[PDB]
Amino acid sequence: KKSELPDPFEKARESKGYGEMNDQDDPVTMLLRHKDVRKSAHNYKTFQSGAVPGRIVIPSEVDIRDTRQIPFEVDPPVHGVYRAIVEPWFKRPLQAEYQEKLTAQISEIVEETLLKGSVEVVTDFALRLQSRALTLLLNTPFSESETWISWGTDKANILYHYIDEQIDRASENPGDDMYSVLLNSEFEGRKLTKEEVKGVMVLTFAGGRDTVINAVTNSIAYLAEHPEALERLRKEPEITGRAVEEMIRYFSPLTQMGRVVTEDTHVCEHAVKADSRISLCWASANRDAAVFENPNEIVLDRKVNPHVGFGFSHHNCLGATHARQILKILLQTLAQKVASFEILDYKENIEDLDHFQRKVGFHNIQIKFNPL
Numbered sequence: 001k002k003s004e005l006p007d008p009f010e011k012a013r014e015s016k017g018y019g020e021m022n023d024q025d026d027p028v029t030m031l032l033r034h035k036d037v038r039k040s041a042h043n044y045k046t047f048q049s050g051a052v053p054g055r056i057v058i059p060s061e062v063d064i065r066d067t068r069q070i071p072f073e074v075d076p077p078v079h080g081v082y083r084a085i086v087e088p089w090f091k092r093p094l095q096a097e098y099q100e101k102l103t104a105q106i107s108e109i110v111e112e113t114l115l116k117g118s119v120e121v122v123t124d125f126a127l128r129l130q131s132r133a134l135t136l137l138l139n140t141p142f143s144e145s146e147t148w149i150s151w152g153t154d155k156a157n158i159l160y161h162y163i164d165e166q167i168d169r170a171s172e173n174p175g176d177d178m179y180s181v182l183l184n185s186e187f188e189g190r191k192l193t194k195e196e197v198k199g200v201m202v203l204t205f206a207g208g209r210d211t212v213i214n215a216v217t218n219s220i221a222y223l224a225e226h227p228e229a230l231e232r233l234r235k236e237p238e239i240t241g242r243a244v245e246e247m248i249r250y251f252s253p254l255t256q257m258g259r260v261v262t263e264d265t266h267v268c269e270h271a272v273k274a275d276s277r278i279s280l281c282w283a284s285a286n287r288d289a290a291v292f293e294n295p296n297e298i299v300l301d302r303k304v305n306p307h308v309g310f311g312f313s314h315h316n317c318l319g320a321t322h323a324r325q326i327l328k329i330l331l332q333t334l335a336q337k338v339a340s341f342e343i344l345d346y347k348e349n350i351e352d353l354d355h356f357q358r359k360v361g362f363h364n365i366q367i368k369f370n371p372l
């Protein structure tokens with residue numbers, strides 16, 4: 001019950017196939033069925049991402065930022081060109097050397113947590129692991145993680161100005177870090193501008209922060225209440241890939257994402273007006289009972305798992321590779337070093353989605369790690 005994430009979208013998904021929420025005078029029609037979420041994600045002409053910066057997020061961020069995120073807020077065919085520039089950078093976590101460093105980080109944090117005995121997972125464990133792992137993706141010095149940890153779980157400008165500062169440092173003194181690589185990369189034969197680099201870099205910091213922190217935290221909670229799962233991962237390491245994907249499905253750490261409707265049409269026989277917003281509710285699609293057997297359970301070795309936790313079609317998650325390695329390594333490290341857990345005290349993080357109230361994880365959760 002404590003590690004459970006209920007599906008608040010069930011009645012509405014099965015009856016009408018959509019829901020509605022209000023957000024800053026820009027109301028949202030939420031798509032809830034797997035089939036419709038896929039068809040709409042693929043149809044960028046009708047449901048566009050290339051809007052006024054901030055608009056496709058929920059809550060909308062139009063009032064807090066001006067800079068267009070890349071490739072997130074760009075439509076094809078231009079989307080594919082920016083995407084081809086950055087995609088090899090994001091595939092780097094497939095390399096053995098990168099995975100060794102990450103194994104060493106995660107091993108270290110698990111061992112130190114075994115000495116403390118009990119920790120607050122969200123801040124003392126998940127935030128530390130996420131920040132340290134991000135130094136590898138960005139290829140910055142390890143110590144930069146302390147800055148990111150200090151930020152914790154006008155306010156956005158702290159991030160935007162820090163990004164501006166690193167872009168400036170890297171233009172003066174080019175090195176090997178992601179900033180430097182982006183400034184030297186080419187879009188149709190010219191170098192990316194600082195504004196474009198900022199577009200990629202703000203997105204990169206923001207898209208992987210809460211999502212990874214929630215996946216890591218939710219995974220430990222789950223393993224704490226399912227000793228049989230913990231033992232299966234110890235004795236059957238081959239299922240770990242599938243367990244990670246199943247955890248992304250069930251937890252769906254990015255609940256939903258907007259699009260802007262460009263023309264009058266219908267979805268589920270419900271009309272949607274041009275210039276309004278829809279949402280692709282990945283978390284509802286990933287519980288659809290026409291698609292997943294036992295959808296409200298974690299089936300640890302599920303082979304058939306067409307989930308949309310990392311999106312679908314054009315904008316599918318670029319951080320997916322990084323995230324998957326974090327989680328495969330975490331699950332295996334816990335299985336080889338921890339015998340059991342106990343959850344001592346917690347407070348839930350509930351997303352206020354108007355008629356729907358969605359547990360996405362925990363604001364805090366104290367957990368005891370007992371050693372093997």
Ligand code: HEM
Nearest residue numbers: 071072207208211212215254309310311315317318319323
């Ligand atoms: C469990 C972790 C994560 C989940 C569940 C997740 C989920 C998603 C989802 C659903 C999308 C699709 C958004 C859309 O359709 O508009 C997406 C896109 C994206 N994610 Fe993630 N994400 C995660 C981790 C990361 C991390 C760690 C990073 C970066 C370090 C990252 C960077 C991105 C980027 C750059 C895109 C945009 C791709 C494009 O526009 O072509 N994500 N993510």
